[PDB]
Design a protein around this ligand. Structure first.
Ligand code: HEM
Ligand SMILES: O=C(O)CCCCCCCCCCCn1ccnc1
Length: 460
């Protein structure tokens, strides 16, 4: 017996119960008709959605091994069953475990890297000279580089036409992946794939970044010395040669290229966007900026670069960084899991290959944990005491076996960089803080911020 749900129409399915502009809201809406676990057929594809902290945790922490799979995402057939994110293969487990180990070994190291990078952000920011600018392609360079150094020991100038091109692709794709047409293409790929439409643009872009990353991996291989692995890409290559004789294969050149692409855009566009929501948020609530400045000055001074150990000393900063991520629910629907082996969830049988959706926004907007969850309120992570307060509901990276791999670097990237930009700059909205609308402009894959420009006016 499957989890409850709407009666599915022929072919179409339960797509009338779905608003493509905004799926998560549809989930929320269905959650209140059928409770915490429900069944949806979209296309022929049959999915199970969990809504709310109890249901989502159970899914992600209790049935780790059962909901191990990764639902398919047709935009990314280019990536499927390879790398990590889109790997629903027998390949998945080890190439993840290895990169995760490697990301660890490059991270103790990570602090310095972000710190080094910050230098350039500030430089690029002063250069705007208190004028209006679109930050999308200023602030995004920082995560990009940080990852570029881990990935290819490569550094970019904030004006390399290729660099900017890669960022544009990441933005174009995130943008596009959160719009209706791709939501539908996501679930009816065979019907739509050869019809015209922006699904074609996404594919073209996925292919462009894969090609580029591909070339870099070949460059690496052609020059690889296995004693001196220069970066991540290297560490992978040496595993690829370590077993050229092994009959059955784990690392193929493609395999690596996908793995690398995965962290490349992953490390870049998630943190860039989050940072950009942060900045916009902070311009809505100038009094929070002011409070934050006070702390930076009190605890770090107007000079010394922010460090990880200052976080324990700064609870307003901390909480802000948290609420930023909680409020904006970047991956509001989580990334799609698949049921691996025939499974019993609460009452219900969940067949094999079922797309399991453990919805994050439903966790992040608990109106018990976070009273007025719809409001941006640092207090959500503060206790009446003024110190930091941790929430078990803070899971915008998810949890369990597919927990975001770049979490540590994400977390650090946000706090440090944000810290930096505020330490040296005040934020200027070009519209009244009263007229700033924080609502995403698209909701699918991700939650996407209004385009906006701003001024940064120095503090030294
Ligand atoms: C704002 C920062 C980020 C957020 C909110 C975020 C969120 C997520 C979420 C929700 C998932 C899916 C978890 C699931 O399937 O249950 C995921 C997966 C993943 N993330 Fe992130 N992520 C972020 C940054 C990063 C960064 C910086 C990297 C690389 C440095 C990265 C690499 C990955 C990879 C490789 C996966 C695939 C998970 C798997 O092994 O199946 N992410 N992330
Ligand atoms: O060619 C390619 O493979 C790269 C082009 C795809 C760029 C799309 C960026 C989407 C934003 C990712 C946010 C979701 N996420 C991923 C990992 N953790 C969260």
């Amino acid at each position: 017996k499957l989890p409850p749900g709407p009666f599915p129409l022929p072919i179409i399915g339960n797509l009338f119960q779905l608003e493509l502009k905004n799926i998560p809201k549809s989930f929320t809406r269905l959650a209140q008709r059928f409770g915490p676990v429900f069944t949806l057929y979209v296309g022929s594809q049959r999915m199970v959605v969990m809504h709310g902290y109890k249901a989502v945790k159970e899914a992600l922490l209790d049935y780790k091994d059962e909901f191990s799979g990764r639902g398919d995402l047709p935009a990314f057939h280019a990536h499927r069953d390879r790398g990590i994110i889109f790997n629903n293969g027998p390949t998945w487990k080890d190439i993840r475990r290895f990169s995760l180990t490697t990301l660890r070994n490059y991270g103790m190291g990570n602090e310095s890297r972000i710190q080094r990078e910050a230098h350039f952000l500030l430089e690029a920011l002063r250069k705007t000279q208190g004028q209006p600018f679109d930050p999308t392609f200023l602030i995004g360079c920082a995560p990009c580089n940080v990852i570029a150094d881990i990935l290819f020991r490569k550094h970019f100038d904030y004006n390399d036409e290729k660099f900017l091109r890669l960022m544009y692709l990441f933005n174009e794709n995130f943008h596009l992946l959160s719009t209706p047409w791709l939501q539908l293409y996501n679930n009816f790929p065979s019907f739509l794939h050869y019809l015209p439409g922006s699904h074609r643009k996404v594919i073209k872009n996925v292919a462009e970044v894969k090609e580029y990353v591909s070339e870099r991996v070949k460059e690496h291989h052609q020059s690889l010395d296995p004693n001196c692995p220069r970066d991540l890409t290297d560490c992978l290559l040496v595993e690829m040669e370590k077993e050229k004789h092994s009959a059955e294969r784990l690392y193929t050149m493609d395999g690596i290229t996908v793995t690398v692409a995965d962290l490349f855009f992953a490390g870049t566009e998630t943190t860039s966007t989050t940072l950009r929501y942060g900045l916009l948020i902070l311009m809505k609530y100038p009094e929070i900026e002011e409070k934050l400045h006070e702390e930076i000055d009190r605890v770090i001074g107007p000079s010394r670069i922010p460090a990880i150990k200052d976080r324990q000393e700064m609870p307003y900063m901390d909480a802000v960084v948290h609420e930023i991520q909680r409020f904006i629910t970047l991956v509001p629907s989580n990334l799609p899991h698949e049921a691996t082996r025939d499974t019993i969830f609460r009452g219900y049988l969940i067949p094999k290959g079922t797309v399991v959706v453990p919805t994050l926004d439903s966790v992040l907007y608990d109106n018990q944990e976070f009273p007025d969850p719809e409001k941006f309120k640092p207090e959500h992570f503060l206790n009446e005491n003024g110190k930091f307060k941790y929430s078990d509901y803070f899971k915008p990276f998810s949890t369990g076996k597919r927990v975001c791999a770049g979490e540590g670097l994400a977390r650090m990237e946000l706090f440090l960089l944000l810290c930096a930009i505020l330490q040296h700059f005040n934020l200027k909205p070009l519209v009244d803080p009263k007229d700033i609308d924080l609502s995403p402009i698209h909701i699918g894959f991700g939650c996407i911020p209004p385009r906006y420009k701003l001024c940064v006016i120095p503090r030294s």
